[PDB]
Design a protein around this ligand. Structure first.
Ligand SMILES: *[C@H](C)[C@H]1/C(=C/c2[nH]c(/C=C3N=C(/C=C4\NC(=O)C(CC)=C4C)C(C)=C\3CCC(=O)O)c(CCC(=O)O)c2C)NC(=O)[C@@H]1C
Ligand SMILES: *[C@H](C)[C@H]1/C(=C/c2[nH]c(/C=C3N=C(/C=C4\NC(=O)C(CC)=C4C)C(C)=C\3CCC(=O)O)c(CCC(=O)O)c2C)NC(=O)[C@@H]1C
Ligand SMILES: CCC1=C(C)/C(=C/C2=NC(=C\c3[nH]c(/C=C4\NC(=O)[C@H](C)[C@H]4CC)c(C)c3CCC(=O)O)/C(CCC(=O)O)=C2C)NC1=O
Ligand SMILES: CCC1=C(C)/C(=C/C2=NC(=C\c3[nH]c(/C=C4\NC(=O)[C@H](C)[C@H]4CC)c(C)c3CCC(=O)O)/C(CCC(=O)O)=C2C)NC1=O
Ligand SMILES: CCC1=C(C)/C(=C/C2=NC(=C\c3[nH]c(/C=C4\NC(=O)[C@H](C)[C@H]4CC)c(C)c3CCC(=O)O)/C(CCC(=O)O)=C2C)NC1=O
Ligand SMILES: CCC1=C(C)/C(=C/C2=NC(=C\c3[nH]c(/C=C4\NC(=O)[C@H](C)[C@H]4CC)c(C)c3CCC(=O)O)/C(CCC(=O)O)=C2C)NC1=O
Ligand SMILES: CCC1=C(C)/C(=C/C2=NC(=C\c3[nH]c(/C=C4\NC(=O)[C@H](C)[C@H]4CC)c(C)c3CCC(=O)O)/C(CCC(=O)O)=C2C)NC1=O
Ligand SMILES: CCC1=C(C)/C(=C/C2=NC(=C\c3[nH]c(/C=C4\NC(=O)[C@H](C)[C@H]4CC)c(C)c3CCC(=O)O)/C(CCC(=O)O)=C2C)NC1=O
Ligand SMILES: CCC1=C(C)/C(=C/C2=NC(=C\c3[nH]c(/C=C4\NC(=O)[C@H](C)[C@H]4CC)c(C)c3CCC(=O)O)/C(CCC(=O)O)=C2C)NC1=O
Ligand SMILES: CCC1=C(C)/C(=C/C2=NC(=C\c3[nH]c(/C=C4\NC(=O)[C@H](C)[C@H]4CC)c(C)c3CCC(=O)O)/C(CCC(=O)O)=C2C)NC1=O
Ligand SMILES: CCC1=C(C)/C(=C/C2=NC(=C\c3[nH]c(/C=C4\NC(=O)[C@H](C)[C@H]4CC)c(C)c3CCC(=O)O)/C(CCC(=O)O)=C2C)NC1=O
Ligand SMILES: CCC1=C(C)/C(=C/C2=NC(=C\c3[nH]c(/C=C4\NC(=O)[C@H](C)[C@H]4CC)c(C)c3CCC(=O)O)/C(CCC(=O)O)=C2C)NC1=O
Lengths: 162, 284, 172, 162, 172, 162, 172, 162
């Protein structure tokens, strides 16, 4: 995983030297950033049931054919819609993981590695989850400097989908 | 190569013993393997004691480590990047990692294309893993054998255009490859996609003139014109350094001349009067 | 790889004297504008893939002969490579914005681009238009205030417009 | 050179990816550290002639033989003492360089690389400059948080001598 | 890597005839002066590190701008580059004295030294002065008799002064 | 270890060939050299207690501060002077080892490998043992051609210290 | 890689005392028998290829099933490899004779030969027999005086018969 | 080429160190060996026309078919026998070269490299030159210590043929 604490560690490991002031200043940049990021994670965990209900209904109204077309890949049957709230319910965990970790580590290790690899096989269009995250980007209800911190990881996932 | 190896400066590589790593541990043979790794991979740059990577060495003493895993670990180290990767172009580096990790100059441009799409998708640290985990590495270098220059012999399957890109790479044993006057830029990025093979220039003193690089818009190697000469033999002579009369007379030193046969004998006499030195004439 | 700080350091090393007081006064201003520098760099990489595709369509409309057969960007491979590359300008531009210096931009993405095209056959001019179509959209993305505090960064945004103009004019 | 801005750059270069929030938080750790470090550099540049006079006289009183023993390596003649103030006058530049750069870059690139390499040849004992820096460590006169920042680079040079 | 013997061998190979009698008479003289050759080579490597530091101080006095800031040998690192190197002349010179031929000196330490400096910025004069300051001390170390039997080696010491003059004039 | 017998062996091993006349002539160069080197070792082993007493007292008169300065590194206390005769008593073993072995093997493997590495840490100045060996170089009492051969290993250790 | 000399050195290093007088008396005897050691080592490598083929025919007669199909040394390739292996015994034996110690023989040619055969299927006993057939011919080559001065080396030839017996018994 | 002088040089080059006493003793082993080897070369150069006449006639009597069988490879015609004295006249040069050089360098560089490579192509049986050299081995006429030195290079060429 990648964390700007461990980013300072693994960089000093390859040179084989002690933690100088170069790696040390990377730590307090992570520390005081957490105080604008931990209540950025509290805004998402409190609103957990709102957003996965909101983004799933936003996908169906954006793409009206995905409720009607017969196929496993789509959401015509009940299982599909049961797998719908599982998927976007899985996205909001990693965003709260990567906000709390303070880096794009959990987004790298758990979501986007091989994400373009599976979507070619199961013909899941990535533009489905683009509109899903863009609903969360506009309706997460967070405000201020802390909100900006929660806004980048949403946009970092979108550029990984495309 | 012997009596060409004296001129080109490749007599030490021509009779160069393989170091290996016999599986019995001994400090001296391990000490002499380590100099053989850092001399070829870092291009005869010197390593000071902070630059030694002494923690790299502890693993080497143990049986599990293999020169091959060690050569992965020196190139991924930030020391090696500080000399070569940061102060250079990415195509130059793809060209450069074949010189150190594989030992040969790049054959085709298509080999190069594969690396860029690997470098983007998986990073530089997985690019060096693809140089090491190649069939051409495993065939000629074992796990316990240092990479050496394979540019000289046949290494069946080589193209000869790559025999001369190796002489564009290092200018003698004595050189750093950061210490060539085109240091930052890729010397073979133009040659790889024009798909021509330029002229071998050897190093200094053994060859009187080392100062020849291929120009941008230079004369074509094979020509069509009879060139006034009564009999068709036409030869293509290039000069290296011209310091003859000044500002209008010489606008461009190192210009390539194409002179036919019957006035070739007077032509060499004009070039020496200009104080220029000839690296090559070639029939075409 | 140089900073604004190590620009002053390597310049003060050559004279061999201590760092003067106004140089520390100038670098103290870079600390104050340091938080605006993270405002502009974070806004580009969030809109990175959206500005690659949007500048690609405006390029391949206005020069239609590229996609067209016989063009340099015709087949799906070359096209993929060219499209992929337009990030590599933006990869090395946003390095230089966060560095505040054009040294990282020069020796990686500028040192051989005008070199590599004569052997490749790609037109230099076409690439410049592509980067100049990034510049008016990258400045326009960082310009507009929506949900950020209002400040003034016209002396800082002009550095970004200088970086694309450095990247454009060195090729075409 | 090494700077926690460029440390974030060269780390993101080998992975071949954009400047995410992992590398971005390393920047503001360097930025707000400078405001406690730039007036830490102003405390040394204003007191330039004091410390190189102070550390040079502190070396002679610590090692009284270095003024008496005949040799080029020592400070018996006048050109030795002229080379004395040159050497410690060269140390205080790099400490002010590495305080302003905010990392141990200039200490790496300009001082300690090959520093143990030359001292074996010219038989300059490193314990001479240990006591020289320890006088600067006690008599710099810096106070507060800024002093702590100027105190590590002195101690980082001492561990490189030993 | 050639000898005095393999110099005659590779020369007699090109003509393709047997080795003549006076060539064996000349090589028999090299056997008789062979023990004086080990006298001179052993005396240099015993005084190797003492003559590197002593020639360095005489160089860096008489060109003071080198270790002065802005100079090519200013910082500690490059300074060790030069210091480490001055052995490498002596490493390849005493190879050539024990070889009795200048072939090993030419293709390792002479073939690219005048090459490598234009890309490096190291001045020519510094190298020439440095090696020519070794030569008058290396000859003077092997000249004086203290605790050895007296002999005559002026026809052999002139080979050593030729080897440094070969190393000096090929660079500057 | 390095021995001109084993130097002929390890060279013929990497080429993978038999002991030709190239490697064989390196043996008798070692053999007849031993007869001028074994009684060069007998001159040192018989005079063992003389030289370690002589070189230790020569160090104190050369550097008079090393008996007075308080520190573990110095010879102010009794256990310093007990460690004094241990160190120069350890040098004379390896010189007699490397004279008997006929090469610089034991000097490489047992003395000078990491010798410049430890002296930076324990602040033992190498110029201490330079003057120690130079007393042995002038007072070993050996004579003739055999004496000269030994003289090299003393000078080979001095260049390794510097 | 150890000598007879460095055998005494590393043994005297462990006790940490000076070299005793009778050890120097014993090593002075090795100097006197040093010229007989070059007599025996030069005689083997001159007859190296003649004793590989001659011991191979006596092996492959007396065990005919090897060459025969289904045997371990049947096909030309394996057969070529086996021939090479025999020399490699002689390569590391004559190293140990010129070294005068069995340390070089042990860690290269003895340390994994009894190891490598269980995975290979080669017969250890057969290999041992082949090695022995070298020993009675290698001793017999160095025994006979023809055009050399007569001496006594029975205390030295028994070291060679010990070296093959060390090489034989460690495998079979 | 390989010479036990240059064998001492190229070994000290890879370690990057000076010519110690390890490489130096390899020189005088070459030097005093030459005095038993240079008049070993004088015994061959004086008897040049004897041996190439002797070995060529010894080949024909050993292999009587090589004078009768029609082919370029054989010695049926006159230009075969003209190429006969050229070949064994070329062997005696390199033996006198490798005796004077004192190593197997010229035998390596000029004779046996690719010697088994060409004989497969031109179907020249190596057992022809085995019996040719064995006549020179018995009829050289050299005696004493010098003869022993000239005897190894003949046997070193035979093992390279087989
Ligand atoms: C894009 C707007 C235009 C374009 C792009 C294009 N380029 C190529 C081929 C190459 N591009 C490069 C570029 C770089 N290499 C570097 O190392 C860096 C900095 C990190 C850059 C920017 C190189 C080396 C090549 C050669 C081959 C390679 O991919 O490795 C192509 C493919 C062309 C071909 O295959 O012949 C394309 C399509 N070309 C256009 O048409 C656009 C105008
Ligand atoms: C100046 C900052 C550095 C420098 C320059 C230098 N140049 C020469 C010689 C020549 N310079 C040119 C240049 C051009 N000729 C052209 O047609 C063009 C394109 C417009 C250029 C740029 C040429 C052709 C020459 C030839 C010699 C002449 O003067 O006619 C020298 C003299 C070299 C000599 O050997 O005499 C020098 C010194 N040298 C430095 O050190 C500066 C850093
Ligand atoms: C922790 C991060 C993470 C995510 C997000 C993830 C998604 C993911 N969704 C999948 C399938 C699926 N994904 C969906 C979701 C959708 N399809 C639609 O029709 C809608 C447009 C859209 C939702 C808005 C559906 C319906 C399936 C089942 C498709 C099938 O079974 O073929 C699959 C393959 C099968 C599976 O195990 O269920 C994966 C791996 N996996 C992960 O590890
Ligand atoms: C044995 C064959 C051999 C030689 C000859 C050799 C020389 C050599 N000198 C070098 C550098 C160098 N050489 C010098 C030498 C000097 N600079 C000055 O200004 C002085 C006048 C002078 C010393 C007196 C310096 C200073 C450098 C380092 C330059 C730098 O780091 O920028 C380099 C470049 C690699 C490196 O520095 O790590 C090489 C290869 N290398 C070899 O393998
Ligand atoms: C020589 C082989 C070759 C092919 C075939 C090829 C196709 C190709 N079609 C593209 C876009 C496109 N492809 C289509 C085609 C379709 N979209 C639809 O809605 C329909 C379902 C479908 C046609 C039946 C459209 C409409 C675009 C423009 C989409 C956009 O601009 O985003 C693009 C990216 C942009 C471009 O340069 O125009 C490529 C590379 N490229 C190649 O080099
Ligand atoms: C690395 C993570 C990180 C980020 C992203 C960051 C941004 C950041 N931008 C700020 C301010 C600001 N940022 C902007 C930026 C702009 N306003 C405009 O209207 C322009 C269009 C645009 C520039 C192009 C402005 C105007 C301010 C006002 C406050 C200040 O000067 O810092 C501040 C001041 C403190 C605060 O907002 O709480 C923060 C935190 N700080 C961090 O620690
Ligand atoms: C930019 C960083 C930098 C430093 C600091 C540096 C120091 C340095 N000091 C040196 C010598 C010296 N250093 C000193 C200094 C001292 N000796 C004493 O007696 C005192 C105890 C002590 C001063 C407090 C003296 C007197 C010399 C001359 C010694 C000689 O010539 O042998 C030398 C070797 C010769 C030279 O060029 O002048 C170097 C390389 N070099 C560097 O590149
Ligand atoms: C200052 C000018 C000068 C030199 C150079 C000199 C050298 C010199 N070395 C000699 C001897 C010798 N020199 C050596 C040296 C060695 N043999 C080896 O095998 C070792 C490897 C090597 C030592 C490391 C030997 C063994 C002798 C034998 C004679 C003697 O003991 O002096 C002799 C004795 C007299 C003679 O040879 O005519 C001379 C002249 N004499 C002079 O007047
Ligand atoms: C499966 C493929 C295969 C083949 C063909 C093969 C041949 C082969 N024939 C051999 C010997 C031999 N080969 C021959 C055959 C001939 N000599 C003559 O005089 C005749 C001209 C000629 C037959 C027409 C003889 C007589 C020997 C014994 C020679 C000796 O023992 O020195 C040998 C070496 C000793 C042996 O194991 O018997 C091999 C390896 N080996 C293989 O693995
Ligand atoms: C320098 C010390 C050393 C030795 C000795 C050595 C031996 C060695 N013998 C091998 C194979 C072999 N060796 C033999 C030998 C024999 N077969 C018989 O029946 C006979 C008893 C015997 C010949 C006398 C055979 C048949 C193989 C190959 C077996 C197979 O691959 O199936 C291999 C396998 C791969 C390869 O050869 O490249 C090694 C490494 N390696 C070493 O480093
Ligand atoms: C059959 C049993 C037997 C052996 C083995 C034998 C060997 C033998 N070799 C001798 C001499 C010698 N042997 C050599 C051999 C060499 N020196 C070198 O440096 C070369 C590398 C090598 C030849 C390649 C030399 C140089 C001598 C000097 C004395 C002489 O000329 O005989 C002598 C002379 C008398 C003696 O040493 O006591 C003996 C005995 N004598 C025997 O009765
Ligand atoms: C410098 C060392 C050296 C030697 C010695 C050497 C020998 C040599 N002799 C050859 C042919 C030959 N060798 C001979 C010699 C003989 N054939 C007989 O019938 C006689 C028995 C015997 C002479 C006593 C003949 C007649 C040819 C021509 C055969 C042919 O053309 O097929 C060939 C192949 C063709 C050639 O270029 O002429 C080589 C390479 N090459 C070398 O580079």
């Amino acid at each position: 995983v990648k964390t700007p604490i461990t980013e300072a560690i693994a960089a000093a490991d390859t040179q084989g030297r002690f933690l100088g002031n170069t790696e040390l200043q990377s730590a307090r940049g992570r520390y005081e950033r957490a105080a604008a990021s931990l209540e950025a994670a509290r805004g998402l965990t409190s609103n957990a049931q709102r957003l996965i209900d909101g983004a799933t209904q936003a996908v169906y109204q954006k793409f009206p054919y995905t409720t009607q077309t017969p196929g496993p890949q789509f959401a015509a049957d009940s299982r599909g819609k049961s797998k719908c709230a599982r998927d976007v319910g899985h996205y909001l965990r990693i965003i709260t993981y990567s906000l709390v970790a303070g880096g794009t580590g959990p987004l790298d290790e758990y979501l986007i590695a091989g994400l373009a690899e599976i979507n070619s096989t199961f013909d899941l269009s990535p533009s489905w989850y683009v509109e899903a995250l863009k609903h969360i980007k506009a309706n997460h209800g967070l405000s201020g400097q802390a909100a900006n911190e929660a806004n980048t990881y949403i946009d970092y996932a979108i550029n990984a989908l495309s | 190569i012997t009596t060409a190896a004296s001129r080109l400066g490749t007599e030490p590589f021509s009779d160069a013993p393989k170091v290996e790593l016999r599986p019995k541990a001994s400090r001296e043979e391990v000490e002499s393997v380590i100099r053989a790794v850092y001399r070829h991979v870092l291009g005869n740059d010197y390593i000071l004691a902070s630059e030694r990577l002494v923690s790299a060495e502890s693993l080497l003493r143990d049986g599990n480590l293999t020169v091959r895993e060690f050569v992965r670990s020196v190139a991924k180290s930030e020391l090696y990047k500080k000399k070569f990767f940061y102060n250079s172009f990415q195509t130059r580096l793809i060209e450069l990692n074949y010189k150190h990790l594989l030992g040969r100059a790049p054959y085709d441009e298509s080999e190069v294309v594969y690396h860029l799409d690997l470098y983007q998708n998986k990073g530089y640290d997985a690019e060096i893993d693809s140089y090491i985990d190649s069939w051409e590495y495993q065939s000629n270098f074992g796990d316990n054998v240092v990479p050496y220059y394979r540019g000289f012999e046949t290494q069946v399957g080589q193209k000869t255009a790559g025999f001369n890109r190796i002489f564009r790479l290092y200018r003698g044993y004595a050189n750093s490859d950061r210490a060539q006057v085109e240091g930052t830029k890729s010397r073979l990025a133009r040659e790889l996609a024009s798909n021509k093979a330029s002229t071998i220039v050897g190093p200094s003193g053994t060859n009187d003139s080392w100062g020849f690089r291929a120009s941008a818009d230079v004369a074509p190697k094979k020509n069509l014109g009879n060139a006034v000469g009564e009999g068709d033999r036409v030869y293509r002579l290039e000069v290296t350094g011209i310091r003859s009369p000044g500002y209008p007379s010489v606008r461009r030193s190192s210009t390539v001349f194409i002179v036919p046969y019957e006035r070739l004998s007077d032509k060499i006499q004009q070039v020496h009067k200009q104080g220029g030195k000839i690296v090559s004439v070639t029939s075409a | 790889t140089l900073d604004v700080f190590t620009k002053v350091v390597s310049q003060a090393d050559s004279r061999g004297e201590f760092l003067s007081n106004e140089q520390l006064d100038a670098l103290a201003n870079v600390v104050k504008e340091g938080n605006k520098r993270l405002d502009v760099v974070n806004r580009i990489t969030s809109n990175a893939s959206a500005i690659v595709t949007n500048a690609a369509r405006a390029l391949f409309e206005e020069q239609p002969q590229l996609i067209a057969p016989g063009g340099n960007a015709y087949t799906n491979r070359r096209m993929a490579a060219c499209l992929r590359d337009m990030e590599i300008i933006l990869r090395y531009v946003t390095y230089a914005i966060l560095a505040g210096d054009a040294s990282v931009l020069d020796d990686r993405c500028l040192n051989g681009l005008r070199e590599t095209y004569q052997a490749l056959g790609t037109p230099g001019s076409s690439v410049a238009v592509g980067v100049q179509k990034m510049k008016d959209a990258a400045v326009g993305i960082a310009n507009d205030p929506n949900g950020i505090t209002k400040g003034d960064c016209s002396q800082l945004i002009s550095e970004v417009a200088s970086y694309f103009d450095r990247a454009a004019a060195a090729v075409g």
